[PDB]
Design a protein around this nucleic acid. Sequence first.
RNA 1: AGACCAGGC
DNA 2: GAAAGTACTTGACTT
DNA 3: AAGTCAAGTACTTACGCCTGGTC
Lengths: 119, 577, 97, 99, 539, 83, 191
Amino acid sequence: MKVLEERNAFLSDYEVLKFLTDLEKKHLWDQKSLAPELQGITRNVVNYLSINKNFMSDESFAELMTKLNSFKLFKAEKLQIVNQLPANMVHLYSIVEECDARFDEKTIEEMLEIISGYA
Amino acid sequence: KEVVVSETPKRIKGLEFSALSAADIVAQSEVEVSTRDLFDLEKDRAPKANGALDPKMGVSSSSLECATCHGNLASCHGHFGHLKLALPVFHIGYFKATIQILQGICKNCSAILLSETDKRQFLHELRRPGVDNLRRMGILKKILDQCKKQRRCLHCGALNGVVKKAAALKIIHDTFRWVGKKSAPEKDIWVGEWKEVLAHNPELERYVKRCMDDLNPLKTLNLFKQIKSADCELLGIDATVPSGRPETYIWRYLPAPPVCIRPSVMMQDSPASNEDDLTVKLTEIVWTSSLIKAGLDKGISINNMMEHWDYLQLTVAMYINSDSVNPAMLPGSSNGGGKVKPIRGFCQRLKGKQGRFRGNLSGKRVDFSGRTVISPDPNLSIDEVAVPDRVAKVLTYPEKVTRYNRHKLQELIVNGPNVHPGANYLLKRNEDARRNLRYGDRMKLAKNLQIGDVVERHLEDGDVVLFNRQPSLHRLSILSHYAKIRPWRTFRLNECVCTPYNADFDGDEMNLHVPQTEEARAEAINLMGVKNNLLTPKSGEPIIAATQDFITGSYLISHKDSFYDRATLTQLLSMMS
Amino acid sequence: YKGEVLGITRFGLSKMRDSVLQLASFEKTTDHLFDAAFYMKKDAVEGVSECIILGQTMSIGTGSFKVVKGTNISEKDLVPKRCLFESLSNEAALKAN
Amino acid sequence: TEGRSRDGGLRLGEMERDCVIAYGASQLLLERLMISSDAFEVDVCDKCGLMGYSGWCTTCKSAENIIKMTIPYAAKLLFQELLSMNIAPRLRLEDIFQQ
Amino acid sequence: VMTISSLEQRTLNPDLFLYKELVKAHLGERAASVIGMLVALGRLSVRELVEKIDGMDVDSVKTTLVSLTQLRCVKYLQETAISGKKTTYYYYNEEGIHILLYSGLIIDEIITQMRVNDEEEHKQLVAEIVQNVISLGSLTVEDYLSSVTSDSMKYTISSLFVQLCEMGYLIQISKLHYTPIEDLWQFLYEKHYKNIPRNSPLSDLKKRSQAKMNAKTDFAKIINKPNELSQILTVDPKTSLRIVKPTVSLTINLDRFMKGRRSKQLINLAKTRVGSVTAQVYKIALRLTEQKSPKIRDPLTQTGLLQDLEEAKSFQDEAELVEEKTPGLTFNAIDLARHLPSASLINSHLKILASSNFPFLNETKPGVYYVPYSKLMPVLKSSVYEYVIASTLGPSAMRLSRCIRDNKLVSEKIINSTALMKEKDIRSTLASLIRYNSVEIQEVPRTADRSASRAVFLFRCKETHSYNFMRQNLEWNMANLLFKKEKLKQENSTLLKKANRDDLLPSELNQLKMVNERELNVFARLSRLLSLWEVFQMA
Amino acid sequence: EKAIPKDQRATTPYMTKYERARILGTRALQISMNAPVFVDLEGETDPLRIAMKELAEKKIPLVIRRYLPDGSFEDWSVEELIV
Amino acid sequence: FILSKIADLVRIPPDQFHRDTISAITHQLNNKFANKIIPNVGLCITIYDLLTVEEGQLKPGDGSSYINVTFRAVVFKPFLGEIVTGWISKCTAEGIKVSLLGIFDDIFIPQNMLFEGCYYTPEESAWIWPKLYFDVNEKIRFRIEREVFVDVKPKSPKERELEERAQEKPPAYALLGSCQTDGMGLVSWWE
RNA sequence: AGACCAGGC
DNA sequence: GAAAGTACTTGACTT
DNA sequence: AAGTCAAGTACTTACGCCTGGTC
Ligand SMILES: [Zn+2]
Ligand SMILES: [Zn+2]
Ligand SMILES: [Zn+2]
C-alpha cells in the first residue's frame, strides 16, 4: 500500500512496552485476567524487553539527559546505550565508533558511573 | 514471512482497437497444430491427440482433464494456439482498406509520393486538438484523391500509374492513361520488352494482351516492409508501436479458436460424437497448407501450385466471412451439386438479429419467471396482483435473516417445502455447496440458523413483482405491483386498468418477473409503481380510470331520474365499504 | 444541431457517435469492426447501450449521483502524543555544536 | 433455454428494453440482465489488457498486476470470438475511489 | 515454443529500432526516447516531446537537446508563421549515428592514409587528437591547443594539424552546414519567385528558367563552400610556418572516408579481375584524383525536390554533363610510374588494363585516360550482388539469376531449354529464387481477360526491390549482433563491476575470458557486414 | 476536484424521485446486513417497510452527493433537504 | 524499532456501525498488517495513531463503508551497524544462526568475517576457537551488516501442480552481520 | 445442436 | 422475384 | 491533358414473442 515516507522521527525501545501495555490493557491484559492473531507480537515483545533489565522508571529517564546531553556521541549511540551492556569497561567500546579515542582517562568513566546509577 | 495483499475496485474506461502483429499469437500459443487433417484420434479409446482438437485447448465433455489446468468444464474457459500458413495468404475484411494503403504509395520505390508543404499542411490539420471522427474520413479521403492526379514521383527513380482493383480477391493495377502520343523513357523500354517476346512466338501475345500488371500478396507484403516510421499517419495508422505497422493486414500466422468457440456436439441419440463445421474448416486448412510445405522443393512444377495457393485465400475468406466463398469456384467430386447454405461458420453466428449481438447479447433471458392467462376481478385494489399458490411454490426469493426474521424464518424452515409458508433452500455463511431442503433434514436444522445465512422463502403477500405483456409498445407496458396468494390457476388483476397493457382478456398471455436484491426491489415499487405511473408519459392526462360497465354503471346510479331510500342507501354505502 | 440535416438511417446514423459497439448493434456487422481496427480507433465506453454490454452501471437516472455517509469523527483527538524520544536525542547534539 | 420438456424462462426484447430505460432505473437493469441470468468473473491485467486463467496472463508472467472483477458471459464469449478472428479488443481499467 | 527463437522481436521493427539501439549503447534512457520518437513520428517540436511520453517534462528535454546538438544528432530548423510567434522543428539528422556506428573505422583510414610519413610519433599523437574531436562533437583550435601541456613542443601536435586540414577529412565549422536539403532549397528559393518587379506577363515558362538557373548557381556556391576553401586553413603569418586559423574550429567530413572504402570496393573488384600489381597501378591513380572525384557525393540535388518525367533527363543529363565535365576536364594528364614505396614506363600495364574493359577500368578519351564515375556503378552493383547470391545459395542460384537478365520476360519454354539441365530441380530453385521477391511474377492471361490458371508466365526486372532486400540486411544483422552483445553485458554485469574495481578464484577468470572472446568476435562481424551494406546504399 | 462550499449552490433545493429510489434502496440494504436502527421499530418484518418508516422521521445519516459537468463536485445532506 | 508513515483505504462493514469509527478502523488496520511483513520498510509490529480521516464513500453495489486514511505504524529495524541481544537456534556447517526471542529467527551469521580460528565439525561439536566457544540456549550479541529483500512469487500453474503431485527460498525479511570485533557472542566472557 | 411446419397475441 | 437507397468506374466540356 | 459535371452497375435490410408437431 501507499507509503508517505521512508522513516519518521526515530523511535527507540522504551514506550513500546509502555504503549503495548495499552494494547495489553485493552484486550484481556494477559496474566492478570487469565485467572485475534495479535498474540504473536504481543507475548513476544513484552517477554524480550522486560527480561533484559530485570536480571522500569518514569522520571530518571528524562533526567538521564543531563550528562547524556553534554556528551557529543550524537544519535546512533544515544538511544542505543539505553539497554545493552550497562556500565562495564569494554562493553560500551563495541557500540560507539571512536569510543576510547578522543577523550579517555576520566570523562568516559563518567558514562560508566551514571549508567551504573541506573539500577 | 507472509507478505500483505491489497485490492482495489476497478471500472472500465474505453477500449483500443487494432491488429495484433505476429508477436501475440505465438505468445498466447499453448500448443501447435502440426500433423494434418485427421482429428488425430488415438486408435484405442478414440481420444484426440495434438492437432486441431486436443487434451489441452478447451474441453467439450464433463471429465476431460485439460492438463493446462484442472477442474474441466466448471473451471477452464479457453486457451489459444496458432497455425503456420505457407506464404502470406491474403486477408478479407481489410481488403477494401488494403487497396487504399496500396493506393497512395508509389510501387517503384515503395514510398509516399506527396510533396513538401502539402504533407506539412495536412500533418498540421489533424493535430488540431479537438477533432470529430468525420474529419478523419474527410482528410484521409482527400489525401488519397490528391495522389490520383500526380503523375510524377519526387525523389526516386521512375514512376507508375494507379490501381483500380479489377477482377474476386484478385488485385491488379493497370498502368494506363499514359501521356498521349508522348514518348516516355520507360515506354521505350516497355515496347522494347515485348518486341523480344512477339519475335519468338507472335501467336500468343497478340492473341490476348493489355492486362497490364498485378500485385502478388507476397510481393505487396514485401512492398509494405520498406515504409516504417516517417508518416503512416496520413495512411491512417498511428504508431505507438505495440503493433508493427501495416505489415499485419496480411495473414501469416492465425489464431486457431478454442473449443469454447465451437464444441464437439454430443447427444442427439446415436452411439458416437459429432464434430462441428468450424472444426472441419481449420483441419482442412492444415492439409491445403502443408500441401505447399511438402511441395516447392521436391516435386511438381510452377503453374500447378499457383491456383492451389490461390485456393487457399478462398478458404480463409470463406472461413471468417460470407459471400467471398463463390468467386468463380465450384467444388467437384462426382459432379452432382453444391449449394449448402449454413456452411458459413464465423461472421454469421456473430451477425445481428438471432445469432449474437442483437438476439443473444442484449436479448438475454430472465430467470425466476412465470406465464399464464388472464381473468378479471373487482375486489383487488389497483397495484395488487393475485398470484396462484401453485406457481408460488416454485417461485422463490432470497432472504438474509437479521435481528428480526430470526423468529418467523426458523418457523418457515420446520414448516417444509410442501405447504405454502415454507422454504425450498438454505445457505449457510460457511459457504457450502448449498442446502436444498426437500430430501430430508429440517427439524434440528432450524435450531442453529446463524445470522449470516441466506434462506429462500416462498412468494407471499407484501412482496414486489413487476408485470409485463410481451408485445411491448410504450413506457406504460412495464409496471410493478404487489403480489397475492389465491386459489386455482390464473393471473388475475384489477379491471380498473385494461389500458396500459391493452388487455381484452380473451385468454391472452402475461409475463411475470420477480426481482432479487433489496436494492432493485425497492427501486421497482417506489419508482415504476402504478400510483406514480397513473399519468401518461406524453399527453400528461390520466391514462387509467373506470371503463365500460363501471362507466355505464355509475350513470344509472347518479341518473337524475333515480331515487333511493335509507335502507337501500344503507347497504349501498356498505357495498361501497 | 451539427449544422447539417441528417440521421436515423444507417448511412446517416454515423455522424456524431464515435462508439463502434452501439453502431454495430443497431445495424451493421463486418465493416465497423474491421474499420475501427484498421484506423486504430479508441473512443470510450460512455453511453447506455454501450454499458449494458460490459455489464456495469448507468450515468443517467438513479446512477446520476454518488451516495455518501458521514464519518462523524471529531477533528480534535486525532493529534498524536510523543514523549521522551524527542527530548534526549536532538537536544544532545544541538548544544555548542 | 426456451420451450417445454426441458425448462422455461422469459424474454426481454430490445423493444421492451427501452421501457425500463425510460423509467431511469439503473439498479433494476444491473440485477436482471446480469445477476439473474449469467454472472461471471474474469481475470484481467491492467497492462496489455486481455483475459487469462487464475493468476497467469500468459504472454507476460506477473500475477502482480492482475485484477479480478465481474462481467457478463456474453461479453467474454464475444471477446473470444472477436480475438479469434484478427482484431484487438483491448481493455483498460481505472479506479472508482480516490475522488 | 518458449519464444526464445526471437520471433517476438522479428516482425515489428524495420529500420526504426536501429537508431535508438545505437544511441542506447551511446547513452541510453532519455537519449533513446527522443530520437526513437523523432524517427517514428518524423518532424518534431519541443513541446510535442512532453505531450506523448510524459518524459520527465522540461528537465530531460532541455538536457537531451543540448546533448544531441553537440554531437549534432538533430537537424535543426527555425521559422515563423503569418499569425506570429516562432517555431523550431527538429529532424533526425543525416546519418550521424552511422558515424557513431563508424568511429574507429574512420580513425583507421585516418591512420593508414596518413602515410607518406613513415612510422612516426604520429600514431599516439593524432589518435589522441581525433578521439577528442568526434567525442566532443566540435573542436575549437585554441581551446584544444590549451589542453596541450606546456614547456614542450607546441607545434609538434600542430606538426599535424595544418596536416589535418590536408585535402579531405577535417574541414571548418560553418553556419548552416547542418540543414535539411529540402528546406535550404526552399529558403534559397526565395528571392527567385520573389524576383520580378511586375516585369511582363509574357512566356510563363521563363519563370521556370529564371528561378531554376539562378537557384542552381546559388546552390553550387553553397555546396562547394565546405568542399574546397583555402582561406582559413592556409593562413601563414610571419615568424612561423603555415598555421591553421586559431579562431575557426573544425569538423570531420563525409568526403574521403566514404571515398576510401568506395575505392576498396573497386579494388576488391579489380584484384578479382587482374593481378596484384595492376590493382596497385590503378590505385596510385585514384589516390591523386580522389580529391576532385564526386563519386559518393553524386546526386546532391536529388533529395529535397522533384525530378520530372519529361525534364528528368534535362535534370539528370545536366548532372551527367557536369559528370562529363569535371572528370574529363580537370583530371590528371598521363604520368609515368609516379613514385611508390618494373622500370621505364608502366603505361603498358595500363594498356592491358585498357584492352580488357568489360565490365570496367580504363575507358578513355583521346590524349587522356580516366574511369567514368557514371557508367561504372551499374557493373559495380552487378558484381557484388551476384556474389551475394553466390555466397548465400549454391551454384544453381547464380546461373539462373543472369538467365533472367540476358534477355527479359520470357516463359519456362525457352528457359528450360536454355538454362541448364533438369526440370524438377529448376522448379525447386525457381521457388527458391522466387521465394523472396527480386524476380516478381509476370501477369498475362490466356484466352481470357482475367479468369484462371494456365495463363502464360514470364520472369523479369525488380532491380530496386532486389536492392532493398539488402537494406533489410542493414539493421537486422547488426541488431541481434549488438543487442545480444549488450545483453551479454547486463547478464555478466555483476562480474564486470567486480573486474573494474579489481583493475581471485578459478571460475571468475573463466567468464572473464568468455565475454572478452565473444566481444572481439562480435565487433569483427559488425565491421564485416558493415563493409557489405555500404556498397548497397547507392543505385 | 475540490467541493463547492456549503455557502452557495446553483443546484435546486428539492430532491428528484430518482434520489428517493436509491435512498430507500441503500438504507434497507444495510438493514439486511444487520446494522442498527435510529428510529422506534414496531413489531414487523422486512428491511423495506422499516426503511420507509425510517425516512418518515428523517433518521437517515446520509449525505447526498451530486456532480456537475465541469466537476465542481457538491455536498447535500438528506435532513436539510425538504419536500 | 522505527516509526513508518503510510496511507491506506479501509472497508468497514455495517456490523461495526454501532461502535465508534476510530475503534472500527483500529481493528481493521490490525487485521491488515500486524505480524505481516511490509515491503522495503522492514517488519511491522503494532499500530500507533490515526490522522487525516475524512468522509467515506459508498459504491452502489454493496452498502459498505470505504474510508481512505493515513496512519503511522510501528515497525522494526535497528540500522545498518547496530548490536542487539539474541541467541542461536539451529546449525550445520555454514555459520551459526542466531534468533532473537520475541521477533524472528531470520538472523543468520555465516562464518566468513567471523574470527580467524572458528570452524564447524561433523563430529556433532558445533564450533571451536583457537580461545573458547559455545552453543544454543546461551545469549549472543550480534552486529548487523547486510540486509536483503525479495518478493518473487510468479509461480506457474504448470510449475505449481508439479510440486503438488510430486510431494526453499523463504527470505521475506532476512538480516545478517559480521561479529569479528572482539567481545561478541557471549556476555559472561566479561564481568 | 442445428432444423422444419402448423398456429397463438 | 423482393425496393430503396448508397457507392463506385467513365464521358461532354472546357482551358 | 488535367478538371470536369453527369452516367451504369453493384450492394445490406426491411416483425415483438411464444407453443405446438415432424427428419
Ligand atoms: Zn484449461
Ligand atoms: Zn517512388
Ligand atoms: Zn499481462
